[PDB]
Design a protein around this ligand. Structure first.
Ligand code: FES
Length: 106
């Protein structure tokens, strides 16, 4: 299923991501270096911060309490569409989801 990662400079990278893989796992394993994923995906670090495109923000499962506690500490601007992408699990229904990657994670 297609996921489009748009870097801060505007370059769009479309990856095909298998069911059940987090957007963070697909990013880090494919050289999307602007997503760090330091804690390994347990919503313990805030370094997989992305901005979910408005056409998909309400299409993905809501942020649980742990993700909310960690989003508080993102280093780039926190926005209404900020999410930790290790919390976004790919499904066929999300095909085409676009996320914009901030210019910093640390
Ligand atoms: S990889 Fe650590 S919060 Fe997402």
């Amino acid at each position: 299923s297609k996921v489009v990662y748009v870097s801060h400079d505007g370059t769009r990278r479309e990856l095909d991501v298998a069911d059940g893989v987090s957007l963070m796992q697909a990013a880090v394993s494919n050289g999307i270096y602007d997503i760090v994923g330091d804690c390994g995906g347990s919503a313990s670090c805030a370094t997989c911060h992305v901005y979910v495109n408005e056409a998909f923000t309400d299409k993905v499962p809501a942020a649980n309490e742990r993700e909310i506690g960690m989003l508080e500490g993102v280093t780039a601007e926190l926005k209404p569409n900020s999410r930790l992408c290790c919390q976004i699990i790919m499904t066929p229904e999300l095909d085409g989801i676009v996320v914009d990657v901030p210019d910093r994670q640390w």
